[PDB]
Structures are given as structure tokens and as C-alpha cells.
Amino acid sequence: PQITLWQRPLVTIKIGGQLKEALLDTGADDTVLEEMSLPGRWKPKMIGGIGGFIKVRQYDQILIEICGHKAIGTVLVGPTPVNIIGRNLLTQIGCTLNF
Amino acid sequence: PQITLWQRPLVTIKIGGQLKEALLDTGADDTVLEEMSLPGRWKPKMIGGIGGFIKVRQYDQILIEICGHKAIGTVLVGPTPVNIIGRNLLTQIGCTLNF
Ligand SMILES: CC(C)CN(C[C@@H](O)[C@H](Cc1ccccc1)NC(=O)O[C@H]1[C@H]2CO[C@H]3OC[C@@H]1[C@H]3C2)S(=O)(=O)c1ccc2nc(NC3CC3)sc2c1
């Protein structure tokens, strides 16, 4: 699809058997999801944004279906206010900016 | 242009007579620039991001030239770690997401 930006660019995702809504976020290097139950091993990590830093759990090789496109990569889980799909996964689904 | 996302989508902007680089950020509702000298009146504002909140100065009807495209709108100025072009200006230059 082509998505204009008059509203937030939210898409439906399926991850870890669960359905969520997430923001397609070109300003985000990595993918950060609100606290959720994910299986397997993870590594602690701190990431920074507009208001400071948050502690997240880093999960690697996680499968996500983003608006019907499959991708596998690192997902960060923690106290973000919004689920964010970052460039690490946007590149896999072929997402581009155009103007 | 079309911009792929293997690197950060940075563009050159001109605002208030100054040249800056800023991130084209679909996850940002509004435009937030690092501390800089702007001329007009302003209003105190507080905005929230991944790690908490920051205090910014809100300037309205500010002219920005973003990758050579002109837009006028609200710019927030404060302790953001990176200059962000948000959807309030992305819509004005015709920016879309495509996949
Ligand atoms: C700041 C930006 C450069 C980074 N961010 C992505 C933005 O898209 C963010 C998404 C968001 C939306 C809503 C709430 C929280 C966050 N946008 C935002 O903060 O917008 C704010 C302000 C703007 O206008 C309104 O719109 C929303 C509000 C509001 C006021 S991130 O999330 O911090 C972020 C994401 C991924 C990431 N990966 C890293 N890896 C490490 C480096 C190797 S670091 C890292 C940081």
C-alpha cells in the first residue's frame, strides 16, 4: 500500500501469536513494543528517546507479520508508550519514503 | 525523491536563516528541533516520548525549507536529542510511506 501521513501510520501486526497495532516509524532505528509476553531468552538493554532512557528486553530472530508481510529480527520489549516498527524491520518489508 | 530506510532518512533543512539536518520521522506527530535561535513569540509546551517528557517552546507559522520544499507550520524547540520533522510538516511536502 501507499500510506499518507494525515493520520498516524498504524498497521496491524501479529507477533508471538498475538495481534497488535503498531506505528510505522521512520525515526526509529529499532522496533520497540509495549510490555508483552514473548517466549525465549533475552538480553537487558537501555535505549534513549525524546525524554530520556528506558530499560528493554532484547529478543533476537523474532518473527513479525507486519500488515501481512513477514519479517524476522530483533524486537525490544519494554515501557514504550506506543508500539513502534523501526527501520530494522521496515527495510525487510520494502518500506520507502516518497515525496 | 524516494528514500529507502537502510540508513536514517536525514535531509537538509533551512529554518530561521540557518542550515540543519533533520530526520524525516513518520512516528512524530509534530516537528521538534534542538535548541536554536528563532525570532517570534512562543508558548510553553510539554511533549512526551519514549523516555518521558521534555519542555519545549512552541513557535507557530514558522517557514521551513525541507529538502528544497517549502512548508509553514508549528515548530517545537527544546532538548530533543535529534532534529525531527513530524507529520505536521511531512503532509505539506507530500511525503508518503510505500511498501
Ligand atoms: C525521537 C526519535 C529520533 C526516536 N523515536 C522514534 C520517534 O518516532 C518517536 C516514536 C514515539 C511516538 C510516541 C511516543 C513515544 C515515541 N516519536 C516521538 O517521540 O514523538 C513524540 C514528540 C514528537 O510529536 C508527538 O508525536 C509523538 C510524540 C509527540 C511529541 S523513539 O521512540 O524514541 C526510538 C525508537 C527506536 C529506537 N531504536 C534505537 N536503537 C539504538 C540507536 C541504536 S534508539 C530508538 C528510539
Residue numbers in the entry:
A (entry chain B), B (entry chain A): 1 to 99
Q: Can you list sentences taken from the study reporting this PDB entry?
A:
GRL-121 contains both Crn-THF and Cp-Abt moieties and more effectively blocked the replication of cHIVNL4-3WT by about 10-fold compared to DRV. GRL-121 more potently suppressed the replication of all three HIVDRVRs. GRL-121 exerted highly potent activity with IC50 values of 0.028 to 12 nM, while GRL-142 again showed even more potent activity with IC50 values of 0.0052 to 0.69 nM. GRL-121 was again found to be highly potent against all the variants examined with IC50 values of 0.015 to 350 pM. The development of DRV-resistant HIV-1 variants was significantly delayed and concentrations above 0.1 µM DRV still inhibited replication at week-36. However, cHIVNL4-3WT failed to propagate in the presence of >0.01 μM of GRL-121 and >0.003 μM of GRL-142 even at week 36, indicating that HIV-1 failed to select any meaningful resistant substitutions.
